[PDB]
Structures are given as C-alpha cells and as structure tokens.
Amino acid sequence: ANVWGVRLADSLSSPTIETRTRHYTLHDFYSDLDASVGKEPWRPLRNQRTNEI
Amino acid sequence: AWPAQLDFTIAGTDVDITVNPYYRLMAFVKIDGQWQIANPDKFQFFSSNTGTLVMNVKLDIADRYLLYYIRDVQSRDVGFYIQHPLQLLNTITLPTNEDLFLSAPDMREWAVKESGNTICILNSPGFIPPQDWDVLTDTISWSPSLPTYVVPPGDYTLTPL
Amino acid sequence: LGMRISALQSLSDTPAPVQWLPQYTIDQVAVDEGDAMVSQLTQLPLRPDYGSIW
Amino acid sequence: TITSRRSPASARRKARLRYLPLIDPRSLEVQARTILPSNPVLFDNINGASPHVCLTMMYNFEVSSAVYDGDVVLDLGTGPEAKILELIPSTSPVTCVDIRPTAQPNGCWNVRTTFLELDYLSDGWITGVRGDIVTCMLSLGAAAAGKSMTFDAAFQQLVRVLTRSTANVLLIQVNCPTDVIRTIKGYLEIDQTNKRYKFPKFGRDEPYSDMDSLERICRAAWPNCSITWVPLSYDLRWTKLALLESTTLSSASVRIAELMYKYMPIMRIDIHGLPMEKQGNFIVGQNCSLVIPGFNAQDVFNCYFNSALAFSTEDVNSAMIPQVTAQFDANKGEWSLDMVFSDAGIYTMQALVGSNANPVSLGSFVVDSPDVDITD
Amino acid sequence: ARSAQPVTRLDQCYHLRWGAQYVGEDSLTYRLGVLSLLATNGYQLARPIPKQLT
Amino acid sequence: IGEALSYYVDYNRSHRVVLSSELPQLPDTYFDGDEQYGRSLFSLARKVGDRSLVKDTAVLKHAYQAIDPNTGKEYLRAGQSVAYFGASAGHSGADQPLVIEPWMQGKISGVPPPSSVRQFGYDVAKGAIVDLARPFPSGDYQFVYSDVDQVVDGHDDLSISSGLVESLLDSCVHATAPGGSFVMKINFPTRTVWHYIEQKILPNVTSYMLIKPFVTNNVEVFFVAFGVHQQSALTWTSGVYFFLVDHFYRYETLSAISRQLPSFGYVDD
Ligand SMILES: C[S@@+](CC[C@H](N)C(=O)[O-])C[C@H]1O[C@@H](n2cnc3c(N)ncnc32)[C@H](O)[C@@H]1O
Ligand SMILES: C[S@@+](CC[C@H](N)C(=O)[O-])C[C@H]1O[C@@H](n2cnc3c(N)ncnc32)[C@H](O)[C@@H]1O
C-alpha cells in the first residue's frame, strides 16, 4: 502492498488489445449532427439515490 | 448344464455354461416386484472367457421354492440382453440320506417337516432352534437375516404357511 | 515486481454473517500470551439480547 | 469481527492444552467480500435444538457422569472434532480412535491425548493400547451398516476384539428396543421384518438386535460380567449440558428425544463383577427369587426402579414393592432375595458394598407385565 | 481486462512532464503522479470502484 | 447458443486395461497468449444463462442413472443427505447455487429429492467456510458434490494445481460415508492426476464414470466415483482412452477455429 491507501497486491493485470483509429469524415459529422434516437452526441448522468438526471 | 452327480457340502456343485464372455451374469433371485440379487456366496464364477464352471451353487431346500432368473449386468441397466430362470434348478431330487442346508425361503412363517410329523415352524415368532440343527457360520440365503441350518435325516417338503 | 499477473477476483456480499470453521497448524505460543492478545482485541463490555431458554 | 459463546465445557477443554495452537489464516485471508454484521444474541437458536441433538447430549452427559478423575479412557469413533475432550475431566489421558482423520491439534496438551485412525472393528491393534473404560456411542450401528453385517455379529466382533484389551468397565451405545416397537413418525420407523431403522432426517439405517442376544454375547465373552441398562432420566438432569452452553430446548423436541431414547439405550458392562442367579419369569404378581453369594453377612442392597430407591434391605418394612424378604444362609454364604413386584421395567440392584466404601454394582434385571391367563 | 476485448486506449494516465519542481513531497499532485504510474504499470485497487462514481 | 452438450464414458469390466501413462493429457501450449485469447473470445460470445446450473443439472441427470453390480437397483436414491463442496456467490437469484431449490423440490424430472443439502466453501453464504484441501470438523455425507476449482489456491502452477487435485480427492474420499458416491471436477487433467487416481482411488471404489457438459471451450472434466470404501480391482480402459482423445481433439479444433475470428468489440476495416 500500500502507498497510503491499500491497493490490491498479489496480482497485476492490464488490457492487451487496442482498437485502430478511425478518421472523421463529413458523413460522420452530419450523422452525429442529426442526432437520431439510437446515437446522440450526449449521454445522461443521473443521481445514485433519487435516480434522476 | 451340470454333471450327473451333485453334492451338498461347503464346496457344493458346479455347472458349465455357454455364453459370450462379454457379460457378467449376476444371480438376481427375485421374490416380488423387487429382484433381490442377494447371492454373494451362493453363486460364484471364475473367468467368463472360458467355460469357467459357473454357478458353484450350495443347494438347500429353499431352491425348491425359488426360481433364480440369471440376469445380465451393465452400468446403466441390468438384465437387458439375457434374462432367463434356472428352470431345472428350480426343482432338484434332494437325497434324504445326505444332510443338507435349511435356509428359509421367505419371512412368512414357513414350517419344517421331516417326514410328515410337522416339525416346528422355521419362521415362527419366538422360535427355538432344535439341538440337532446346526447354524452355518455364513448364512447362505438371499436375506442376511435368515440363518442356515443342517438337516441330515429326511427333512423334505417344507410346508407353506 | 515479484507479484503474479491475474485480474481482480471479487467474491460476493451477503447481508448476514456466515459460519466459520477453524483449522489448526503446528506452531504454538503461550496461553497467557493468547489471553492478553484477546484482551487487547476484545469488545466484551456490551449488553447482548438475551433470547429464550425454553 | 468473530462472534461466539463460551461454556463450562469450553473451560474444561481449555484446561487441558498447555500451549494454545495457532490456526492457519488462509480461509480468512481469502475473503475479499463484505459480510454485514448483526446484533449479538446469547441464545441465538430460535427454533430450539433438535431431537437428534438432545439424544446426543443425553449420551454425552452419561459419559461425563460415568468417567471419574485421573482415569485412562479410549473412545471408539469420536469424529473430526473430539467432543469427548470437553466431557471428561482435564486430568486423564483420552486416547481415541476414528476411521476418519481428526481435525484437532497435535501436541500441546497437559495430559497425553493421542489420535489414530485404524478401523477399531478389526484385529491386531489393542494389545499395545491402554485404557480402563471404553465408550462407543452412535458409531456401532454405523460400522455395522458400513460393513453390511448384522448388529449382533458386529457386537460380537467388537467384544471379541475388546477381550484382548485391558479395560475393566465398558459402556457403549448398543442398539436394541427396550419397549413395544412404536415407529416414531417422521424420525424413526422400525422395520419388523428386516430389522432396520431408516432415520428419515439423515437417510441412514442400520440393523439392531435384542436384549437377550446381547446379554448372551456378553456372558460368552466374560462369565463374571455385570450387565446393566442405564435408565433414561425423567428428571432432566442432562439439561445442564444444553442450558449452560446457550441452546434452546423446544419441549416437543425433548419429548421426541425421550421417546427415541428407549430404542437406542446404552448398556454398561463391568468385566470384574459379581454374578447372581435368577429365575425364569420375574413377572409382576408372582414370586421372584434371587441368589447372590459371598458378601460376608453385610448385605446392604438397594434396587432402583429408575433412580429412586426400592428395598434398601436395611428394613424390609420400608420397601416400595408389595412384598420382599431376605435370608443369609450362613452355611452357603448366599442371600435368597424373594419378593413380588408391581411395576414392569428394569431394575439396577446397586448392591452397596459391605463396607464404608462406595457401592459395587451388580447386574440389572427386567420384570415382565402380568399374564393374561385366567381360569374359573 | 479480458485478453479478448479491445479497449480504445492502453493507458489513460497523464504522466506530469515539466512542473514537478514546483510540487515536491506530500502534495496531492505528487501522490497522484505516483498512483498514475502504478496504474499504468498494472496495479489494482483492493477496494472495488463503482461503475458510476459519487 | 443453446444448452450444453453432454459427453460421458462409464466403467465397464469388459473393455480393456490400460496404464495411466498411456492416456493423453493437457497440451503444452495451453497457457499461451493466443490460446487464452481464443478461450476468452469463445466465453464472451457464448450466450447461456447460469453455467453452473446447466452443468449441475446435466451431471445429476447423468449421475442418477448408474446402478451398482453388488445389488440391483442403483447407487443414488431419495433422501441421501448430500453435501455441496464449493458453494458459491450470489447468482442474481438466491444466494446459493441455483440447483439446490429445484433439486430439493423435485423439479429436475430425473432426480429424486435428497433429505438435506449442506454447503461449504470460501464464497458460501448459508454454510461454513473452510479450506476443503484439509480435514475439518464435520459429519458424514452419503453424496458429496464438489465444484471447487484448482485456480484460487493453485498459484498459477500446473504442478501445484495437480497436487491440490490430489489433496481434494483425498479429502472428498475421507468425507463421503462408506457406501456412497462423490463428484469432483478436474480443471487441468494431467498424467500425474491420472496416475494418482489409478493408484489411490480406483482400488477403493466399486464403479465410476467421468462426464463433460460442454458449455465453454476448455479442458475441464468431471469425475464421478460410486460406492467408496469398498475393495475392488479397477483400472482405466479403452473407453476412457477414446473419450479423452475425442475430448482433447475437439478442444484443439474449437481453439484453432476461435483463434481466427476477430475480437469481441473490434472495428472492421
Ligand atoms: C457421526 S460420528 C458420531 C461420533 C460421536 N460424536 C461419538 O463419538 O459418540 C460416527 C463415527 O463413528 C465412526 N465409526 C463408524 N464406522 C467406523 C469403523 N468402520 N471404523 C472406525 N470408525 C467407525 C466413524 O468414523 C464416524 O466418524
Ligand atoms: C469456480 S467456483 C465454483 C462455483 C460453483 N459452481 C457455484 O456456483 O457454487 C470455485 C469456488 O470454490 C472455492 N474454492 C476454491 N478453492 C477452495 C478450497 N481449497 N477450499 C474451499 N473452497 C475453495 C472458491 O471460493 C470458488 O467460489
């Protein structure tokens, strides 16, 4: 183990695969700009007790 | 098949059988809907590959009332390929001159008869064994509760009850 | 870094205490030492719910 | 946090060990979870103990009362947890045997206690072992069922192997019905034909025997044995082991346990005892003679119905039976106790010694109910 | 991590580059730099971190 | 998608005798990067409910079919006083293995309900927690069903895992009520495990079978022994040989297939 608050000892892991970058095109810009029901450019965060945005 | 001569001793008799050695052939002497294999020392085989002189049976009066139905033994199922009774071992001419074993057929109060005098019932409640009848060290019967006796003079035609 | 490689394996939570069965080893210590240590770690001065004899 | 209760049995166990063992912390170190607490309660068990537990506690109390101080013992089939270590006093060697390997510490005990797994129902292991009293409770029927033999055969093998032993007193949990078979519903249904039990709460079953057969085997083993059938205590004296260690009783359960004890009694056997002749019937309403020789004109005897005294023989006019007499017969050196009883059951006949020392026990005997034969 | 599920980035930490001379021992920036180095090398917290922080 | 595929082979006294050294074992390249990639991909893409529930139902169905040779009826029956080694965490339903409720109520349609079910393991919620690789204070059970794995205590070492398998076989045979049966899982079948089982477990067992409910690509196998604490001469057979061959070869084929598919959340180009 611990630095000032105890961290998991006895094991150690990390990711292995990384996705390749995707260039951003005008079609993508337009599709993001006309926010459809399935994929908006935002995402609501809500409280953990009242369960409201 | 069995030889022309048979003895009633601790060594008993032995029969020969023709069958494919793939099987196991336990006894399974049934009495009711249940089967009650219940023959650890009554039957005994040497090596199924040869004739192996199967069924070293130790005969006693109970066989006269007991049909055996030699069955096959497998892992999942039992007696599925071959299952037939020992038809002529159902009935044997018992030599009254030589002593024999006196196991009981069933719990339902079977009465022993020597020559018609109606000896005391074997499975009678509160039974006292006669001094002549000797109890074998290991009872040769399907039920472990039933002991084994010896009856040298006559002692045939075990009457039902 | 002498530690092995494996993801965190977390057990589950339960709202009530669970029974435990101890198991013993070879090493030994002094009985008075154990009693002093349990006196250091104890929480005895509390009023428990009595219950019912019969 | 670790919660638990203590008990005088716990203190008696703690009085044995010299060095306190150390657990291995793996089972607690592995815990990477969250277990919410709860308020502590002294008598946590809200449904009360079960009848099996009550019967086991009756057995344990009987063992603890039988064992004295500074006596070498050996229990047959104790289990992974040596519960007997909490029963008998903390100043006596307690070498016990069981087929399954133990779970108790090794070393760090004041008085020597040894463990060993060797299938006690076998030949060639007792000649080296030492002991005075031997206890085998709730294990003999299990072994008989395991080896697939009859209870009488298993008992005879046990007695023949114990003949090699050096013990003198012997008390075991024999398996015999001492009353009209009732088949207690839901806990024990007896099979008249095959003579099995089929405990429905554990899916177990093992054979049993009868009193005359067991006594005949014991007599064939030793001629001077003094068989005695310990009676169940209606006075609830065994309740100490339950209440003093935080266990609720649940009276229906204790009643079921009392009903179930009569089919699984425990006989006590004294290898060095005093034989005594008897008659055939000993049925109530009829005369009953009894011969006991060689107590040199000091014959303070007292047979017990269950635990109360009856015919203390210091004055026959104060007995609790319809009639009783005694005579010395100096030429023969044997008393002829003839009396008539009024209640069927088992009597102890404690036979207080002709001296200031404690009483040396004699055998027990059962009296049969009245006959139903009448003629005018 | 699952060894068969790709991520959009192998490490998220920052690794403060220049201004460390202005922040020495027992400062939150220094301690967070140490923790970010540990997380990049592949350590794990003994306490489970929720899916939606609070 | 779907349920699990069951593959079993049970002992028969008529096939053949074969030494442990003649049996196949775990492949060498089993803990490699690409191998773990394939296994993890297949596990992620598998669509099933409770793996433990599926496995346990299949194993119990295939286990209540055996019948002993020493008698006629069968090994397992109703009211057996079972013990469940390796009880587990919550499963989004009850806080115990999801087989206990249906198997007590008599819902599996091939199993009679037992008398009671006691639980043990590090991650149990309604039973004691103990180290099952060592003796511990407990009663005796006519049927112990062990699901404890050799990963939590095996410190990422095949030899240590094999030794743990040996110790767990030893414990599970000490705690199994002479005349009953048990079920143990083997994560990493190796020739040391086969030799130990042949030398120590077979001579004290009446019959056995070993099954494999296929739900995810791996080489785990279950071992079921019947009628413990009874002398007998038993050995591995040609049936077990063929079973192990097909087992390992289908593992190899599915691994070679799954190591050619794309990742789980890949972006195609
Ligand atoms: C469940 S326990 C109860 C023991 C009880 N606490 C007592 O000692 O009074 C029954 C024990 O009897 C033992 N007993 C039954 N058959 C065994 C025999 N074949 N070998 C030695 N142990 C015998 C078993 O080892 C088992 O642990
Ligand atoms: C993969 S799980 C099996 C879970 C099981 N299928 C279930 O759902 O109930 C293996 C479990 O066994 C436990 N375990 C592993 N090694 C053990 C040991 N030596 N003693 C006791 N429990 C152990 C672990 O805590 C883990 O929860």
PDB file of all heavy atoms in Angstrom, chain F residues 168-189:
ATOM      1  N   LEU F 168      -7.579 -32.692  -2.746  1.00  0.00           N
ATOM      2  CA  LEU F 168      -9.033 -32.575  -2.733  1.00  0.00           C
ATOM      3  C   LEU F 168      -9.707 -33.919  -2.966  1.00  0.00           C
ATOM      4  O   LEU F 168     -10.752 -34.198  -2.372  1.00  0.00           O
ATOM      5  CB  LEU F 168      -9.491 -31.547  -3.765  1.00  0.00           C
ATOM      6  CG  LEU F 168      -9.554 -30.109  -3.252  1.00  0.00           C
ATOM      7  CD1 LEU F 168      -8.181 -29.596  -2.897  1.00  0.00           C
ATOM      8  CD2 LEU F 168     -10.180 -29.217  -4.302  1.00  0.00           C
ATOM      9  N   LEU F 169      -9.143 -34.759  -3.837  1.00  0.00           N
ATOM     10  CA  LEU F 169      -9.619 -36.137  -3.925  1.00  0.00           C
ATOM     11  C   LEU F 169      -9.517 -36.840  -2.582  1.00  0.00           C
ATOM     12  O   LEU F 169     -10.446 -37.542  -2.163  1.00  0.00           O
ATOM     13  CB  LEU F 169      -8.829 -36.906  -4.980  1.00  0.00           C
ATOM     14  CG  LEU F 169      -9.101 -36.595  -6.448  1.00  0.00           C
ATOM     15  CD1 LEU F 169      -8.085 -37.280  -7.331  1.00  0.00           C
ATOM     16  CD2 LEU F 169     -10.493 -37.060  -6.816  1.00  0.00           C
ATOM     17  N   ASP F 170      -8.396 -36.651  -1.884  1.00  0.00           N
ATOM     18  CA  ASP F 170      -8.205 -37.295  -0.591  1.00  0.00           C
ATOM     19  C   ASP F 170      -9.265 -36.842   0.408  1.00  0.00           C
ATOM     20  O   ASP F 170      -9.893 -37.662   1.086  1.00  0.00           O
ATOM     21  CB  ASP F 170      -6.804 -36.984  -0.076  1.00  0.00           C
ATOM     22  CG  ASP F 170      -6.368 -37.919   1.026  1.00  0.00           C
ATOM     23  OD1 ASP F 170      -7.137 -38.847   1.356  1.00  0.00           O
ATOM     24  OD2 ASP F 170      -5.258 -37.722   1.565  1.00  0.00           O
ATOM     25  N   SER F 171      -9.488 -35.532   0.501  1.00  0.00           N
ATOM     26  CA  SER F 171     -10.500 -35.012   1.416  1.00  0.00           C
ATOM     27  C   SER F 171     -11.892 -35.517   1.052  1.00  0.00           C
ATOM     28  O   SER F 171     -12.626 -36.038   1.905  1.00  0.00           O
ATOM     29  CB  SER F 171     -10.464 -33.486   1.412  1.00  0.00           C
ATOM     30  OG  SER F 171     -11.468 -32.961   2.255  1.00  0.00           O
ATOM     31  N   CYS F 172     -12.266 -35.384  -0.224  1.00  0.00           N
ATOM     32  CA  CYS F 172     -13.586 -35.791  -0.679  1.00  0.00           C
ATOM     33  C   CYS F 172     -13.825 -37.285  -0.513  1.00  0.00           C
ATOM     34  O   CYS F 172     -14.981 -37.706  -0.433  1.00  0.00           O
ATOM     35  CB  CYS F 172     -13.765 -35.381  -2.140  1.00  0.00           C
ATOM     36  SG  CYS F 172     -15.390 -35.713  -2.816  1.00  0.00           S
ATOM     37  N   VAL F 173     -12.769 -38.095  -0.463  1.00  0.00           N
ATOM     38  CA  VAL F 173     -12.973 -39.509  -0.178  1.00  0.00           C
ATOM     39  C   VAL F 173     -13.006 -39.783   1.323  1.00  0.00           C
ATOM     40  O   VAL F 173     -13.682 -40.719   1.759  1.00  0.00           O
ATOM     41  CB  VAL F 173     -11.914 -40.376  -0.881  1.00  0.00           C
ATOM     42  CG1 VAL F 173     -10.542 -40.149  -0.285  1.00  0.00           C
ATOM     43  CG2 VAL F 173     -12.293 -41.838  -0.794  1.00  0.00           C
ATOM     44  N   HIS F 174     -12.303 -38.991   2.138  1.00  0.00           N
ATOM     45  CA  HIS F 174     -12.443 -39.172   3.582  1.00  0.00           C
ATOM     46  C   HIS F 174     -13.828 -38.784   4.075  1.00  0.00           C
ATOM     47  O   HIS F 174     -14.314 -39.351   5.058  1.00  0.00           O
ATOM     48  CB  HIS F 174     -11.403 -38.366   4.359  1.00  0.00           C
ATOM     49  CG  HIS F 174     -10.014 -38.915   4.271  1.00  0.00           C
ATOM     50  ND1 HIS F 174      -9.660 -40.124   4.826  1.00  0.00           N
ATOM     51  CD2 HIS F 174      -8.878 -38.392   3.756  1.00  0.00           C
ATOM     52  CE1 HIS F 174      -8.374 -40.339   4.623  1.00  0.00           C
ATOM     53  NE2 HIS F 174      -7.876 -39.303   3.974  1.00  0.00           N
ATOM     54  N   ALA F 175     -14.473 -37.813   3.434  1.00  0.00           N
ATOM     55  CA  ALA F 175     -15.723 -37.263   3.952  1.00  0.00           C
ATOM     56  C   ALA F 175     -16.944 -37.775   3.203  1.00  0.00           C
ATOM     57  O   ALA F 175     -17.870 -37.006   2.937  1.00  0.00           O
ATOM     58  CB  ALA F 175     -15.678 -35.740   3.917  1.00  0.00           C
ATOM     59  N   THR F 176     -16.992 -39.061   2.841  1.00  0.00           N
ATOM     60  CA  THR F 176     -18.020 -39.488   1.900  1.00  0.00           C
ATOM     61  C   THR F 176     -18.724 -40.782   2.299  1.00  0.00           C
ATOM     62  O   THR F 176     -19.166 -41.528   1.421  1.00  0.00           O
ATOM     63  CB  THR F 176     -17.440 -39.646   0.498  1.00  0.00           C
ATOM     64  OG1 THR F 176     -18.494 -39.949  -0.423  1.00  0.00           O
ATOM     65  CG2 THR F 176     -16.417 -40.761   0.480  1.00  0.00           C
ATOM     66  N   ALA F 177     -18.854 -41.060   3.608  1.00  0.00           N
ATOM     67  CA  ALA F 177     -19.833 -42.027   4.115  1.00  0.00           C
ATOM     68  C   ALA F 177     -19.755 -43.398   3.459  1.00  0.00           C
ATOM     69  O   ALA F 177     -20.523 -43.658   2.524  1.00  0.00           O
ATOM     70  CB  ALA F 177     -21.249 -41.475   3.951  1.00  0.00           C
ATOM     71  N   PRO F 178     -18.815 -44.274   3.887  1.00  0.00           N
ATOM     72  CA  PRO F 178     -18.513 -45.514   3.147  1.00  0.00           C
ATOM     73  C   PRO F 178     -19.724 -46.311   2.689  1.00  0.00           C
ATOM     74  O   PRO F 178     -20.522 -46.792   3.496  1.00  0.00           O
ATOM     75  CB  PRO F 178     -17.681 -46.319   4.154  1.00  0.00           C
ATOM     76  CG  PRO F 178     -18.072 -45.791   5.482  1.00  0.00           C
ATOM     77  CD  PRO F 178     -18.326 -44.329   5.272  1.00  0.00           C
ATOM     78  N   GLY F 179     -19.857 -46.430   1.371  1.00  0.00           N
ATOM     79  CA  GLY F 179     -21.066 -46.914   0.735  1.00  0.00           C
ATOM     80  C   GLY F 179     -21.733 -45.900  -0.171  1.00  0.00           C
ATOM     81  O   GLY F 179     -22.758 -46.225  -0.784  1.00  0.00           O
ATOM     82  N   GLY F 180     -21.199 -44.683  -0.293  1.00  0.00           N
ATOM     83  CA  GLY F 180     -21.789 -43.643  -1.093  1.00  0.00           C
ATOM     84  C   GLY F 180     -20.952 -43.283  -2.303  1.00  0.00           C
ATOM     85  O   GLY F 180     -20.136 -44.076  -2.794  1.00  0.00           O
ATOM     86  N   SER F 181     -21.153 -42.061  -2.792  1.00  0.00           N
ATOM     87  CA  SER F 181     -20.510 -41.607  -4.015  1.00  0.00           C
ATOM     88  C   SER F 181     -20.186 -40.124  -3.905  1.00  0.00           C
ATOM     89  O   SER F 181     -20.690 -39.423  -3.027  1.00  0.00           O
ATOM     90  CB  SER F 181     -21.399 -41.858  -5.236  1.00  0.00           C
ATOM     91  OG  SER F 181     -21.631 -43.242  -5.415  1.00  0.00           O
ATOM     92  N   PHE F 182     -19.338 -39.652  -4.817  1.00  0.00           N
ATOM     93  CA  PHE F 182     -18.974 -38.243  -4.859  1.00  0.00           C
ATOM     94  C   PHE F 182     -18.730 -37.824  -6.300  1.00  0.00           C
ATOM     95  O   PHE F 182     -18.679 -38.650  -7.213  1.00  0.00           O
ATOM     96  CB  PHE F 182     -17.741 -37.953  -3.996  1.00  0.00           C
ATOM     97  CG  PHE F 182     -16.490 -38.635  -4.459  1.00  0.00           C
ATOM     98  CD1 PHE F 182     -15.619 -38.006  -5.329  1.00  0.00           C
ATOM     99  CD2 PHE F 182     -16.168 -39.896  -4.002  1.00  0.00           C
ATOM    100  CE1 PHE F 182     -14.467 -38.629  -5.746  1.00  0.00           C
ATOM    101  CE2 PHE F 182     -15.016 -40.522  -4.416  1.00  0.00           C
ATOM    102  CZ  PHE F 182     -14.165 -39.888  -5.288  1.00  0.00           C
ATOM    103  N   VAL F 183     -18.570 -36.515  -6.491  1.00  0.00           N
ATOM    104  CA  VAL F 183     -18.347 -35.926  -7.806  1.00  0.00           C
ATOM    105  C   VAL F 183     -17.337 -34.802  -7.650  1.00  0.00           C
ATOM    106  O   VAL F 183     -17.572 -33.856  -6.890  1.00  0.00           O
ATOM    107  CB  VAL F 183     -19.642 -35.383  -8.430  1.00  0.00           C
ATOM    108  CG1 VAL F 183     -19.335 -34.663  -9.726  1.00  0.00           C
ATOM    109  CG2 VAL F 183     -20.631 -36.505  -8.662  1.00  0.00           C
ATOM    110  N   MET F 184     -16.219 -34.896  -8.364  1.00  0.00           N
ATOM    111  CA  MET F 184     -15.189 -33.872  -8.318  1.00  0.00           C
ATOM    112  C   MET F 184     -14.856 -33.408  -9.724  1.00  0.00           C
ATOM    113  O   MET F 184     -14.824 -34.209 -10.660  1.00  0.00           O
ATOM    114  CB  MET F 184     -13.916 -34.376  -7.633  1.00  0.00           C
ATOM    115  CG  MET F 184     -12.836 -33.319  -7.555  1.00  0.00           C
ATOM    116  SD  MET F 184     -11.386 -33.827  -6.622  1.00  0.00           S
ATOM    117  CE  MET F 184     -10.327 -32.407  -6.882  1.00  0.00           C
ATOM    118  N   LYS F 185     -14.608 -32.111  -9.867  1.00  0.00           N
ATOM    119  CA  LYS F 185     -14.191 -31.544 -11.139  1.00  0.00           C
ATOM    120  C   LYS F 185     -12.676 -31.417 -11.185  1.00  0.00           C
ATOM    121  O   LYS F 185     -12.022 -31.166 -10.170  1.00  0.00           O
ATOM    122  CB  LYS F 185     -14.826 -30.175 -11.377  1.00  0.00           C
ATOM    123  CG  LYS F 185     -14.290 -29.069 -10.508  1.00  0.00           C
ATOM    124  CD  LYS F 185     -15.033 -27.776 -10.781  1.00  0.00           C
ATOM    125  CE  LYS F 185     -14.688 -27.235 -12.154  1.00  0.00           C
ATOM    126  NZ  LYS F 185     -15.341 -25.926 -12.410  1.00  0.00           N
ATOM    127  N   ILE F 186     -12.125 -31.588 -12.378  1.00  0.00           N
ATOM    128  CA  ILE F 186     -10.692 -31.510 -12.607  1.00  0.00           C
ATOM    129  C   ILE F 186     -10.474 -30.474 -13.695  1.00  0.00           C
ATOM    130  O   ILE F 186     -10.846 -30.695 -14.855  1.00  0.00           O
ATOM    131  CB  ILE F 186     -10.102 -32.865 -13.004  1.00  0.00           C
ATOM    132  CG1 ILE F 186     -10.318 -33.883 -11.886  1.00  0.00           C
ATOM    133  CG2 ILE F 186      -8.626 -32.726 -13.317  1.00  0.00           C
ATOM    134  CD1 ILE F 186     -10.024 -35.299 -12.301  1.00  0.00           C
ATOM    135  N   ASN F 187      -9.886 -29.339 -13.328  1.00  0.00           N
ATOM    136  CA  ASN F 187      -9.651 -28.288 -14.311  1.00  0.00           C
ATOM    137  C   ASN F 187      -8.590 -28.704 -15.318  1.00  0.00           C
ATOM    138  O   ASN F 187      -8.774 -28.555 -16.531  1.00  0.00           O
ATOM    139  CB  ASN F 187      -9.239 -26.995 -13.613  1.00  0.00           C
ATOM    140  CG  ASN F 187     -10.343 -26.414 -12.766  1.00  0.00           C
ATOM    141  OD1 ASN F 187     -10.244 -26.372 -11.543  1.00  0.00           O
ATOM    142  ND2 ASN F 187     -11.398 -25.941 -13.414  1.00  0.00           N
ATOM    143  N   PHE F 188      -7.462 -29.215 -14.834  1.00  0.00           N
ATOM    144  CA  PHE F 188      -6.254 -29.387 -15.640  1.00  0.00           C
ATOM    145  C   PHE F 188      -5.836 -30.848 -15.584  1.00  0.00           C
ATOM    146  O   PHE F 188      -4.923 -31.216 -14.834  1.00  0.00           O
ATOM    147  CB  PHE F 188      -5.140 -28.468 -15.137  1.00  0.00           C
ATOM    148  CG  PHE F 188      -5.447 -27.002 -15.285  1.00  0.00           C
ATOM    149  CD1 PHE F 188      -4.848 -26.072 -14.460  1.00  0.00           C
ATOM    150  CD2 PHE F 188      -6.369 -26.561 -16.214  1.00  0.00           C
ATOM    151  CE1 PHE F 188      -5.139 -24.732 -14.581  1.00  0.00           C
ATOM    152  CE2 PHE F 188      -6.663 -25.222 -16.339  1.00  0.00           C
ATOM    153  CZ  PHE F 188      -6.048 -24.308 -15.521  1.00  0.00           C
ATOM    154  N   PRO F 189      -6.485 -31.713 -16.364  1.00  0.00           N
ATOM    155  CA  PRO F 189      -6.169 -33.149 -16.324  1.00  0.00           C
ATOM    156  C   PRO F 189      -4.748 -33.406 -16.799  1.00  0.00           C
ATOM    157  O   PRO F 189      -4.393 -33.088 -17.934  1.00  0.00           O
ATOM    158  CB  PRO F 189      -7.201 -33.763 -17.274  1.00  0.00           C
ATOM    159  CG  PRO F 189      -8.306 -32.771 -17.324  1.00  0.00           C
ATOM    160  CD  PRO F 189      -7.647 -31.433 -17.223  1.00  0.00           C
TER     161      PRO F 189
END
